[PDB]
Design brief:
Shape: globular
Subcellular location: Nucleus
CATH topology: SAND domain
Function: May act as a transcription factor. Plays a role in the innate immunity against intracellular pathogens. Required for resistance to M.tuberculosis and L.monocytogenes. Promotes apoptosis of infected cells.
Protein name: Sp110 nuclear body protein
CATH superfamily: SAND domain-like
PDB class: structural genomics, unknown function
Radius of gyration: 13 Å
Order of helices and strands: EEHEEHHEEH
Number of helices: 4
Keywords: sand domain, KDWK motif, nuclear protein, structural genomics, RIKEN Structural Genomics/Proteomics Initiative, rsgi, unknown function
Distance between the termini: 40 Å
């Protein structure tokens, strides 16, 4: 609704991040991502969750090697945001 979440670029705070792949759009949930890059964490506009891979197929990049590269968040690829310490991309082991 009108009032729900505040923060222009303060999204890094929320467990959800805006992701886009080709002609597809959804949202990544760090909480649902922690489990694995196979679990449906990317929720499209239809609300139907999709696996890091599925989401890609929706756009037509199934032939992609790195989902972090194809998937763009706010115009910046996940990998880019991660490097800037913005994205956790799961529990970093080391």
């Amino acid at each position: 609704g009108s009032s729900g979440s505040s923060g222009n670029d303060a999204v890094d705070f929320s467990p959800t991040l805006p992701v886009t792949c080709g002609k597809a759009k959804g949202t990544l949930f760090q909480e649902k991502l922690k489990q694995g890059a196979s679990k449906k964490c990317i929720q499209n506009e239809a609300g139907d969750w999709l696996t890091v891979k599925e989401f890609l197929n929706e756009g037509g990049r199934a032939t992609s090697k790195d989902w972090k590269g194809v998937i763009r968040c706010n115009g910046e690829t996940l990998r880019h945001l991660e490097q800037k310490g913005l994205l956790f991309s799961g529990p970093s082991s080391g």
